[PDB]
Design a binder for this molecule. Structure first.
Ligand SMILES: CCCCCCCCCCCCCCCCCC(=O)OC[C@H](COP(=O)([O-])OCC(O)COP(=O)([O-])OC[C@@H](COC(=O)CCCCCCCCCCCCCCCCC)OC(=O)CCCCCCCCCCCCCCCCC)OC(=O)CCCCCCCCCCCCCCCCC
Ligand SMILES: CCCCCCCCCCCCCCCCCC(=O)OC[C@H](COP(=O)([O-])OCC(O)COP(=O)([O-])OC[C@@H](COC(=O)CCCCCCCCCCCCCCCCC)OC(=O)CCCCCCCCCCCCCCCCC)OC(=O)CCCCCCCCCCCCCCCCC
Ligand SMILES: COC1=C(OC)C(=O)C(C/C=C(/C)CC/C=C(/C)CC/C=C(/C)CC/C=C(\C)CC/C=C(\C)CC/C=C(\C)CC/C=C(/C)CC/C=C(/C)CC/C=C(/C)CCC=C(C)C)=C(C)C1=O
Ligand SMILES: CCCCCCCCCCCCCCCCC[C@@H](O)O[C@H](CO[C@H](O)CCCCCCCCCCCCCCC)COP(=O)(O)OCC[N+](C)(C)C
Ligand SMILES: CCCCCCCCCCCCCCCCC[C@@H](O)O[C@H](CO[C@H](O)CCCCCCCCCCCCCCC)COP(=O)(O)OCC[N+](C)(C)C
Ligand SMILES: CCCCCCCC/C=C\CCCCCCCC(=O)OC[C@H](COP(=O)(O)OCCN)OC(=O)CCCCCCC/C=C\CCCCCCCC
Ligand SMILES: CCCCCCCC/C=C\CCCCCCCC(=O)OC[C@H](COP(=O)(O)OCCN)OC(=O)CCCCCCC/C=C\CCCCCCCC
Ligand SMILES: CCCCCCCC/C=C\CCCCCCCC(=O)OC[C@H](COP(=O)(O)OCCN)OC(=O)CCCCCCC/C=C\CCCCCCCC
Ligand SMILES: CCCCCCCC/C=C\CCCCCCCC(=O)OC[C@H](COP(=O)(O)OCCN)OC(=O)CCCCCCC/C=C\CCCCCCCC
Ligand SMILES: CCCCCCCC/C=C\CCCCCCCC(=O)O[C@H](COC(=O)CCCCCCC/C=C/CCCCCCCC)COP(=O)(O)OCCN
Lengths: 115, 114, 175, 70, 347, 83, 318, 98, 105
């Protein structure tokens, strides 16, 4: 209940700042002023053209390594179990495979950007 | 499928314990030391019957024993106990460790009087 | 009855699903999926699943950032489409909105078996349990049980993650 | 100076003092002056609800001692 | 691909299938399917080309949709009963989702469209794997939940699979598409008897797998993927063509060959349940599969097609790599009819 | 002997980060199996009373079960006080 | 009365950001043998007010090629999330007491990047697109290492509750137990707030203005306020996480003062770092995070899982 | 049932229809797959929380992990398709027929 | 199809997670623990075909606990009658059902 009110207040303040910024000052908009900026000149092509990503392989690995965090964040609660040997074995086992997955992609030139 | 039987409102009446959570927490250790037998009997009834309607008299005995315990505390020294539970009540987590002097004084009072 | 907050959150969930299912430009699709993830996090929070809702929000934020990067890399067009820039996308969006409206109306104003079974509404508060005990969160205990009860699950999950890394590297090799 | 940077730092420190002090003062003002109760678990919430019920004025922070057991 | 990586991926596919086999929990079966698909996708792309990429993409889309439907059905079943065990689903809607999901995984009609294209787009080894090993897990799941299936939907899908397999195979000149349509028809035959006797399904699975393994190995040995390319094998390896012709006759279900026994047992088992019309239609439709098998046998072994001059150079070279199990698979695909009563060991 | 010594010298010269990471990981893997306090951690986890201790119905044949919390029978946490 | 507390939180934060701009200008001036703003008011105390009034009385412009809805939404999201990041911080009492405050801050921080991404894309300009892609790269670089560092540090706390960190550090600062993790966390927060030497998204020398190049006037000012508020919030979070101030339940103002001085010192440390170093290349940042920070982070995660078990020092409150 | 259950089920149905109906971009369909997974996560979490089945609180996490595996697989395939054709359109994938 | 390696080796790979009445951490019970316990013990060892018929009562109780359809129907009927009675003024709610009750611990 309180968090919804806080979020509403923050969003309302930001929107009101936008409204003040957009309705208080004098506006003189013409085509030259609103045109796209490339430091002195008209752009050759469109900004919506395909923009190559040279780190595309690391981007896919980030997806798999981000879910490693989901499996590891309950660890503080897992340390309170009675069978500490089993939990420690499985926690260490999970990180070892994460370390081995990083080592595999490193040694097979997966961390280097496309040329 | 059958009619559910319920106790009448008269049978559910008891002399209620109207002290706050801070007072209960301050007294809890000695309360569990002194009123162990009726509480344990009530819990045994509770986990054996698996029905709240079958352990009403045990609950009333629990209330009576708690009232007797608090009456003894009030009769013998209410001032150290009041200081202790006020100190406990100030804390937002009601932590024991922040009140050791008041807890001590209450402890010597109960140990010497009772 | 009581403030129907979860009803509004689930309606916004369905609205975002319609938004990214009408399939505008993947930028707006990812925006709709982010909105859906946030409102689903709120829904799960309203039933006591703080960890699960927050975790799914975090995971989908990371996934949608990767998806935005990939959309700019390989899924662009000269004029990216919005929900009102195309007859097909707008028609799909309106059809989804009105289908959800019809389902909701027929659900709360009378009792009908839509596809599986029927329901009257009454809000979510009715089906609760009013259980009163504990110095812990049962969700947290159940999730932490993965490292003591779910050894088999941890093994298969770790193997699948390592194999997934190997698989993406095998696929993106080329030649 | 180098000590002319200090007035801005002091103003920023005064601004940063306000949130925590105001939060503490508001908690005390709205919780009987005794450090607003923390309910991280259901047992603490049960204690708070029982405290509200037995207060007689529908306020959990109104504490009844041994004077309420006749 | 590094040979170690290929071995790891094949072992991961097999381990996912075995996880589906040995699990009592629906989540573990879903996990097995996910692991199987994850390790399977690279194997289709081992020889890189746009056709292999397209086949892998279509396969991934189809199997991911089937997995989503699978999980949704599992969740419905959990909702209407707090059960995770795979014994018998408690909701008809969840069971319909489960059936549609497993049929899409198997490639039953009208979810058959992906099978011929994916089979054509990959190599012969990947085709062998896809058409033999990938059927075990969904069929095992269907066997475990047999008492819950709706006979009408299952039998409709089976009859459609048989009809569409025959009709599609009638029109093919590429050998991989012929094998894919044959696989669709055989899957229809297998799923026709599942609501009545799972032992018959297992027997049909074993015989179909044996025949398909023998046929794919014979196609690898004579490295041909089209009808006209296989037409040249007589001028280099007549024994291979003769064995191919006999195996094709066995696949058509002609007595006294092995391929006849599963159809015979399925027909008699269905007649035990007062089902007469549908087995009759099933055999009359498998006549089409026999027809295009006979066309392939005409073009491959029973007549001699013209050859090229460069075959003389091939005459001087033997096969460097030999397949160890090809001889056994041919014998089991042809000469096992007298050993029929051994099917009691399958139950 | 000398081959591994030269390999470790080269690794320390070129990749001290990886050397430190492997050393810390190996220590974290092996040290817990040799520690005498792991059992103390297990016992501390076991000694935390999360739920209510349900009493047993006395039948006259439980000499090792207390009839009151302050009775000498039952587990003792004296080891924890001095730890 | 709760809205009073919300305002007493948000408004002083905005004032602190406004004067942090002046503190930055003066500190970087004095490290560069000059003075910085000292004319607009005594010691330049009126400079932030003049800057804000000039910015909000200037004309905002919509680019002709821009996508209007996302263009307007992005600064709103940035400023609102920057304000929202402060509600679970215990100073020593939080406005919103959460069981999982750290992970909530993680999720909100992860969501904050989309303001930069969407502003860069909706500007429909090449430099803004380059800035947005650099932001994607930066998040991919730092996210996993930052989260695992939080996990390893909080393993000694016993929960994800921010107020428990005060109790955990009643006798000693957590830094004396996890200083390598503290250094890596400090660098990760430098990268997370797009601050030098990791100020890649704006990239002023290389990309002119980067993601916010199209923005002018009031909308531009909100991006600036969001960035500076995020800097202050991150430094305050670091102070709570690694420098535990002693809290007296009967005198919380002492804790508040100690907290404020520590977070001011950390903010000045950021300012010093900006004044001291050149800029990374944005592939070098990812190589640093994935080849040096990630292995040590994994090893120290293993070590911090094993250590409480080895020494029988597991914290309470499952 | 609660009406939230119907809302989540219709979210799943809408995402499934969105996947089954294809526009030009391959990426849009991957988003529909992710949406189906999100709806499955929400529904399973609600069912598990309502019935207080403690041990399956970890099951949605496994669901999320295999969702990430699926998304990585789809993105890799999209990379290869776009490298082949310079575009992620589905109509370019027509070399193989029935 | 189903090779029961777990039963042959006594491994318990995933059987700990199949049912709601099976050894939850900290002995936290399921909301329908007793109904499922009764239904499982009714149907044990008699086969699936008989379990459906001779144990339909226990399964019906378990499903009612799970989804609470009949309870919601009864509550809806009671509240509809209550609203109908108030709208004509024949019935008045008691003070303890209007927010003026005397609370008890
Ligand atoms: C039920 C229906 C759902 C209601 C939708 C909500 C309201 C949005 C509709 C108004 C925006 C469109 C106006 C417009 O086109 O130009 C304005 C107008 C016309 O300009 P123009 O140059 O003449 O013509 C431009 C072209 O026509 C076209 O120019 P364009 O390229 O800008 O067109 C794109 C635009 C056009 O819109 C459409 O195509 C149709 C509108 C349907 C959109 C719904 C799709 C579903 C998306 C997900 C669900 C979101 C929640 C919806 C449910 C409501 C309940 C909250 O689509 C959008 O971008 C709208 C996106 C809204 C989502 C914002 C949420 C923020 C996410 C933050 C993180 C989330 C955390 C987790 C939670 O210019 C102005 O007036 C200045 C800008 C004013 C915009 C103010 C801010 C945008 C609206 C706020 C969103 C609501 C947040 C709460
Ligand atoms: C019952 C149902 C009826 C039968 C079932 C249906 C049969 C269909 C089977 C098709 C198999 C496909 C195949 O293998 O190749 C097709 C192959 C055609 O290929 P090709 O033209 O000859 O040349 C292909 C070359 O290999 C070109 O490739 P290359 O140049 O890279 O050569 C590498 C080659 C040479 O290999 C090497 O180089 C060896 C080097 C060793 C590397 C060390 C790697 C170990 C590390 C990985 C560990 C992973 C563990 C997984 C952990 C999971 C955790 C949950 O390796 C292979 O060819 C593949 C190796 C196959 C591995 C088999 C091992 C069994 C795995 C069992 C897993 C279950 C674990 C427990 C599960 C518990 C539940 C969770 O077909 C045949 O050769 C004849 C068919 C034989 C089928 C079996 C006969 C029927 C049953 C008797
Ligand atoms: C190497 O050169 C450079 C510098 O060195 C000289 C810089 O400083 C520098 C940083 C930019 C400076 C010029 C600082 C600019 C100051 C801000 C833009 C002003 C922001 C102040 C307001 C918008 C905050 C709001 C104003 C209120 C008073 C706060 C309270 C809010 C109410 C609701 C109450 C840059 C980029 C630079 O390039
Ligand atoms: C810091 C956070 C808190 C902020 C609190 C203040 C929030 C302010 C929000 C922004 C509003 C203030 C902006 C400046 C004043 C408003 C002026 C403008 O926005 O309104 C005009 C509204 O004009 C309307 O188009 C027509 C006027 C008549 C409208 C009739 C509505 C009903 C009136 C009925 C008359 C009888 C009385 C009814 C009211 C009681 C349109 O202005 P326009 O010229 O485009 O813009 C140029 C701006 N300049 C000139 C100041 C530079
Ligand atoms: C027959 C051939 C065997 C070898 C090949 C098999 C291939 C599969 C991989 C391994 C088989 C899985 C068997 C392990 C099942 C886990 C359950 C069993 O081991 O007991 C656990 C014992 O824990 C053990 O430590 C299991 C961990 C050992 C496995 C980790 C490394 C081995 C995996 C290697 C293959 C995985 C992929 C490749 C990685 C290199 C838990 O017992 P405990 O906690 O007391 O009590 C639980 C009951 N409670 C909850 C009420 C308290
Ligand atoms: C968050 C930090 C800042 C917070 C935002 C609030 C800033 C408050 C500053 C108020 C200063 C007063 C504003 C004056 C400038 C307004 C814009 C302007 O200059 O327009 C001048 C314009 C010129 O028009 P013409 O001469 O007819 O045409 C010439 C061209 N053909 O004249 C006007 O329109 C004057 C209108 C009066 C302005 C209203 C000011 C009232 C104060 C509102 C403050 C809002 C607080 C929130
Ligand atoms: C946006 C992302 C939403 C995330 C909000 C997280 C807030 C939070 O974590 O507070 C948790 C708090 C308490 O949890 P505990 O830690 O267990 O402590 C109390 C128990 N004693 O939970 C709550 O208060 C739940 C309140 C309702 C949830 C809020 C849902 C917000 C969803 C955002 C939707 C946006 C509006 C709709 C349209 C969106 C786009 C137009
Ligand atoms: C409902 C479905 C029921 C399925 C019944 C299937 C019947 C089995 C017979 C299959 C015949 C298939 C013939 C065919 O498809 O094409 C006709 C064929 C095409 O020539 P191709 O070799 O394929 O190409 C050469 C040029 N490139 O043209 C011909 O000349 C056919 C010559 C041989 C035809 C033999 C037909 C003999 C039929 C005998 C009567 C009984 C047939 C079965 C039905 C019985 C009546 C109920
Ligand atoms: C003052 C009178 C108020 C009128 C409001 C009209 C708003 C409008 O659309 O007008 C466009 C207006 C001014 O443009 P012009 O018409 O060209 O110039 C005006 C001067 N003649 O532009 C704006 O200011 C738009 C401002 C945005 C409105 C606020 C609503 C946006 C809501 C954002 C929701 C997203 C939240 C994201 C974070 C939350 C997630 C937890
Ligand atoms: C048993 C512990 C296991 C668990 C703990 C480890 C957890 C995290 C650590 C593992 C993370 C993965 C690291 C993967 C290593 C990749 C190696 C590699 O290929 O990098 C080489 C460089 O690294 C090498 O030199 C190859 C290996 C060298 C040895 C590395 C450490 C091996 C073990 C050393 C210490 C052993 C244990 C400590 C004992 C200390 C002695 C008392 C290439 O460098 P580039 O960045 O590409 O160059 C670009 C600019 N030229």
């Amino acid at each position: 209940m309180n968090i919804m009110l806080t979020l509403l207040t923050n969003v309302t303040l930001a929107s009101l700042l936008v409204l003040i910024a957009f309705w208080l000052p004098q506006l003189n908009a013409y085509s030259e002023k609103t045109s796209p900026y490339e430091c002195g000149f008209d752009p050759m092509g469109s900004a919506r053209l395909p923009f190559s990503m040279k780190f595309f392989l690391v981007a896919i690995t980030f997806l798999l390594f981000d879910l490693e965090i989901a499996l590891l964040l309950p660890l503080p609660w897992a340390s309170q179990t009675n069978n500490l040997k089993t939990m420690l074995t499985m926690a260490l086992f999970l990180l070892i495979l994460l370390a081995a997955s990083l080592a595999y992609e490193w040694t097979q030139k997966g961390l280097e950007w496309a040329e | 499928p059958g009619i559910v039987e319920l106790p009448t409102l008269e049978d559910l009446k008891v002399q209620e314990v109207k002290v706050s959570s801070s007072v209960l927490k301050a007294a809890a250790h000695h309360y569990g030391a002194q009123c162990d037998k009726p509480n344990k009997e009530f819990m045994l009834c509770r986990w054996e019957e698996k029905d709240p309607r079958r352990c009403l008299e045990e609950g009333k005995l629990v209330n009576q024993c708690a009232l007797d315990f608090f009456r003894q505390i009030k009769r013998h020294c209410a001032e150290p106990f009041t200081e202790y539970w006020t100190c406990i009540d100030y804390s937002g987590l009601q932590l024991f460790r922040h009140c050791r002097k008041q807890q001590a004084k209450f402890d010597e009072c109960v140990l010497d009087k009772l | 009855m009581t403030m129907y907050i979860a009803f509004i959150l689930s309606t916004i969930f369905v609205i975002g699903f319609v938004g990214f299912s009408s399939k505008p430009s993947p930028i707006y699709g990812g925006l709709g999926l982010i909105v859906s993830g946030g409102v689903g996090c709120g829904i799960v929070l309203n039933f006591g699943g703080s960890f699960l809702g927050l975790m799914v929000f975090l995971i989908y934020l990371g996934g949608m950032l990767v998806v935005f990067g990939y959309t700019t890399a390989m899924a662009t067009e000269m004029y990216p489409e919005v929900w009102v820039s195309n007859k097909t996308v707008f028609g799909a969006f309106v059809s989804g909105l009105m289908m959800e409206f019809c389902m909701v109306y027929y659900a709360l104003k009378e009792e009908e078996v839509e596809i599986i079974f029927k329901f009257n509404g009454l809000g979510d508060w009715v089906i609760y349990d009013t259980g009163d005990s504990g110095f812990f969160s049962e969700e947290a205990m159940g999730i932490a049980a993965l490292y003591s009860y779910g050894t088999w699950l941890v093994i298969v999950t770790g193997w699948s993650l390592l194999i997934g890394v190997v698989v993406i590297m095998e696929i993106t090799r080329g030649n | 100076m180098w000590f002319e940077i200090l007035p801005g730092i002091a103003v920023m420190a005064a601004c940063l003092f306000i949130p925590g002090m105001a939060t503490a003062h508001i908690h005390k003002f709205t919780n009987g002056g005794k450090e607003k109760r923390v309910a991280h678990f259901s047992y603490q919430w049960n204690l708070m609800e029982r405290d509200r019920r037995i207060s007689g004025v529908n306020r959990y922070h109104v504490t009844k001692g041994l004077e309420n057991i006749d | 691909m590094n040979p170690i990586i290929y071995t790891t991926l094949i072992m991961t596919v097999m381990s996912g299938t075995m996880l589906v086999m040995i699990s009592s929990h629906w989540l573990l079966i879903w996990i097995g399917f996910e692991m199987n698909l994850l390790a399977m996708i690279p194997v289709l792309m081992k020889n890189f080309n746009p056709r292999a990429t397209e086949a892998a993409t279509k396969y991934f889309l189809t199997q991911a949709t089937a997995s989503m439907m699978l999980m949704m059905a599992i969740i419905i079943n959990l909702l209407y009963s707090g059960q995770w065990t795979i014994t018998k689903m408690f909701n008809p809607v969840a069971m319909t989702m489960m059936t549609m999901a497993l049929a899409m995984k198997l490639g039953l009609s009208p979810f058959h469209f992906w099978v011929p294209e994916v089979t054509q787009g990959i190599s012969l080894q990947a085709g062998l794997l896809l058409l033999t090993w990938q059927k075990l897990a969904p069929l095992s799941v269907l066997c475990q939940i047999s008492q819950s299936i709706n006979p009408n939907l299952m039998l409709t899908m089976a009859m459609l699979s048989i009809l569409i397999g025959g009709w599609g195979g009638l029109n093919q000149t590429q050998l991989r598409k012929i094998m894919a349509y044959s696989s669709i028809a055989h899957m229809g035959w297998m799923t026709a008897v599942l609501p009545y006797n799972t032992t018959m399904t297992i027997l049909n699975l074993l015989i179909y797998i044996t025949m398909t393994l023998a046929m794919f190995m014979l196609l690898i040995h004579s490295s041909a993927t089209t009808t006209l390319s296989l037409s040249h094998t007589w001028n280099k390896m007549p024994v291979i063509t003769s064995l191919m012709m006999v195996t094709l006759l066995s696949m058509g279900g002609l007595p006294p060959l092995s391929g006849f026994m599963p159809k015979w047992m399925i027909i008699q088992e269905m007649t035990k349940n007062e089902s007469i019309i549908m087995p009759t239609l099933m055999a009359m439709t498998a006549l089409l599969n026999l027809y295009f098998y006979m066309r392939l046998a005409y073009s491959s072994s029973l007549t001699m097609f013209p050859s090229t001059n460069n075959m003389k150079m091939k005459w001087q070279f033997e096969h460097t790599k030999q397949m160890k199990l090809l001889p056994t698979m041919i014998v089991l695909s042809t000469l096992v009819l007298p050993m029929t009563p051994a099917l009691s060991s399958l139950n | 002997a000398g081959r591994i010594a030269s390999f470790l010298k080269n690794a320390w010269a070129k990749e001290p980060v990886l050397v430190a990471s492997f050393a810390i990981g190996g220590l974290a893997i092996i040290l817990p199996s040799l520690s005498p306090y792991t059992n103390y951690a297990i016992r501390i986890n076991r000694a935390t009373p999360y739920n209510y201790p349900v009493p047993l119905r006395d039948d006259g044949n439980m000499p090792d079960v207390p009839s009151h919390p302050q009775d000498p029978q039952g587990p003792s946490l004296e080891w924890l006080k001095n730890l | 009365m709760f809205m009073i507390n919300i305002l007493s939180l948000i408004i002083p934060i905005l004032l602190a950001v406004a004067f942090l701009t002046l503190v930055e200008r003066k500190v970087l001036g004095y490290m560069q043998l000059r003075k910085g703003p000292n004319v607009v008011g005594p010691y330049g105390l009126l400079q932030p007010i003049a800057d804000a009034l000039k910015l909000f009385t200037k004309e905002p412009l919509r680019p002709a090629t821009s996508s209007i809805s996302m263009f307007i939404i992005a600064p709103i999201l940035a400023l609102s999330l920057a304000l929202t990041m402060w509600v679970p911080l215990p100073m020593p009492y939080p406005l919103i007491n959460m069981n999982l405050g750290v992970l909530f801050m993680l999720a909100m921080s992860s969501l904050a990047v989309y303001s930069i991404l969407w502003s860069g894309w909706a500007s429909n300009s090449k430099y803004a697109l380059i800035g947005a892609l650099r932001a994607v790269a930066q998040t991919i670089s730092y996210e996993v290492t930052l989260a695992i560092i939080l996990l390893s540090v909080l393993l000694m706390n016993g929960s994800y509750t921010l107020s428990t960190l005060i109790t955990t550090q009643e006798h000693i600062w957590m830094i004396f137990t996890s200083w390598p993790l503290a250094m890596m966390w400090f660098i990760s927060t430098l990268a997370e707030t797009n601050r030098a030497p990791f100020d890649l998204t704006e990239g002023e020398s290389e990309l002119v203005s980067g993601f916010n190049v199209e923005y002018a006037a009031g909308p531009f000012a909100m991006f600036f306020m969001a960035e500076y508020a995020n800097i202050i919030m991150m430094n305050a979070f670091t102070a709570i996480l690694f420098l535990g101030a002693s809290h007296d339940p009967h005198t919380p103002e002492l804790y508040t003062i100690n907290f404020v001085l520590k977070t001011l010192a950390l903010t000045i440390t950021f300012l010093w770092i900006r004044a001291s170093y050149p800029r990374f290349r944005y592939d070098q940042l990812m190589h640093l995070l994935w080849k040096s920070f990630l292995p040590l982070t994994l090893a120290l995660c293993m070590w911090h899982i094993s250590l409480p078990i080895m020494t029988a020092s597991i914290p309470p409150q499952s | 049932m609660p009406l939230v259950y119907m809302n989540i089920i219709m979210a799943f149905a809408i995402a499934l229809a969105g996947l089954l109906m294809y526009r030009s971009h391959l990426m849009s369909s991957l988003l529909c797959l992710e949406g189906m997974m999100l709806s499955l996560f929400i529904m399973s979490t609600l069912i598990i929380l309502n019935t207080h089945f403690t041990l399956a609180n970890m099951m949605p996490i496994i669901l999320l992990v295999f969702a990430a595996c699926e998304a990585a697989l789809g993105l890799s395939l999209l990379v290869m398709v776009s490298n082949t054709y310079g575009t992620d359109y589905v109509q370019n994938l027509n070399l193989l027929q029935c | 199809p189903f090779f029961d390696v777990q039963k042959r080796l006594g491994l318990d790979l995933d059987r700990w997670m199949t049912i709601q009445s099976a050894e939850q951490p900290h002995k936290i019970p399921g909301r329908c623990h007793a109904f499922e316990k009764e239904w499982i013990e009714c149907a044990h060892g008699i086969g699936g075909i008989r379990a459906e018929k001779e144990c339909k009562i226990e399964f019906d109780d378990f499903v009612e606990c799970l989804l609470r359809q009949k309870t919601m129907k009864r509550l809806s009927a009671i509240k509809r009658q209550r609203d109908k009675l108030i709208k004509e003024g024949k019935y008045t709610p008691p003070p303890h059902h209007l927010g003026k009750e005397d609370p008890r611990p």
